Design a protein around this ligand. Structure first.
Ligand SMILES: [Cl-]
Ligand SMILES: [Cl-]
Ligand SMILES: [Cl-]
Ligand SMILES: [Cl-]
Ligand SMILES: [Cl-]
Ligand SMILES: [Cl-]
Ligand SMILES: [Cl-]
Ligand SMILES: [Cl-]
Ligand SMILES: [Cl-]
Ligand SMILES: [Cl-]
Ligand SMILES: [Cl-]
Ligand SMILES: [Cl-]
Ligand SMILES: [Cl-]
Ligand SMILES: [Cl-]
Ligand SMILES: [Cl-]
Ligand SMILES: [Cl-]
Ligand SMILES: [Cl-]
Ligand SMILES: [Cl-]
Ligand SMILES: [Cl-]
Ligand SMILES: [Cl-]
Ligand SMILES: [Cl-]
Ligand SMILES: [Cl-]
Ligand SMILES: [Cl-]
Ligand SMILES: [Cl-]
Ligand SMILES: [Cl-]
Lengths: 110, 110
């Protein structure tokens, strides 16, 4: 599994689970999550790690810009952790109601 | 913030989101997740960290039950990360349906 990834690496995969993105756009999504700046020197070595692990695929677009996307193995890692999180969180009917409301509101906002 | 926690620390919170637990029980749940041993010396220093951060407490349910449990702030942290994860995962109708099915199957197992 990918269950030994860092939180930062897992968050990259979560970002790419929404859609494929350029490196700079991943950085912005992570900054919005953390509420803090994310340095290029942290992001890109971690992207290279995820590509080497087969969880992310890279597509070069010019010379300063790459597009990154989940592989199926990377998507499986996102789903695996979501399934585990939900298995623990959905502990009674009120928890089930909370989750279902979140999902339906996210879908309605699309 | 709770968004700066390590993956290991976030996984403790997830375990306690299911129910309050004795330390040895947290260890078991984490070992089932990771598929590798989790040493005393990794788990308990991090439990102490989460207590000092106000996310976990030692609770005394009755006179003979003293377990680890989420504080209100710890529960907020678990919900906050689930909300962010779902906001990125629920990216179209098929993703919506997938999460609905995960939740329904979890609920049925209760
Ligand atoms: Cl981490
Ligand atoms: Cl991290
Ligand atoms: Cl994480
Ligand atoms: Cl983008
Ligand atoms: Cl870029
Ligand atoms: Cl960009
Ligand atoms: Cl998750
Ligand atoms: Cl699971
Ligand atoms: Cl309930
Ligand atoms: Cl709830
Ligand atoms: Cl309901
Ligand atoms: Cl609700
Ligand atoms: Cl227990
Ligand atoms: Cl114990
Ligand atoms: Cl123990
Ligand atoms: Cl026990
Ligand atoms: Cl498992
Ligand atoms: Cl305490
Ligand atoms: Cl709680
Ligand atoms: Cl999550
Ligand atoms: Cl959010
Ligand atoms: Cl899907
Ligand atoms: Cl059902
Ligand atoms: Cl059933
Ligand atoms: Cl049934």
């Amino acid at each position: 599994d990918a269950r030994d990834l860092t939180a930062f690496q897992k968050n990259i995969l979560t970002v790419l689970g929404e859609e494929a993105r350029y490196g700079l756009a991943i950085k912005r999504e992570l900054e919005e999550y953390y509420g803090e700046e994310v340095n290029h020197g942290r992001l890109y070595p971690n992207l290279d790690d995820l590509v080497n692990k087969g969880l992310v695929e890279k597509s070069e677009l010019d010379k300063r810009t790459n597009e990154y996307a989940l592989t199926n193995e990377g998507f499986d890692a996102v789903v695996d952790d979501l399934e585990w999180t939900l298995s623990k969180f959905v502990a009674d009917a009120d928890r089930r109601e909370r989750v279902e409301t979140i999902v339906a509101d996210d879908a309605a906002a699309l």
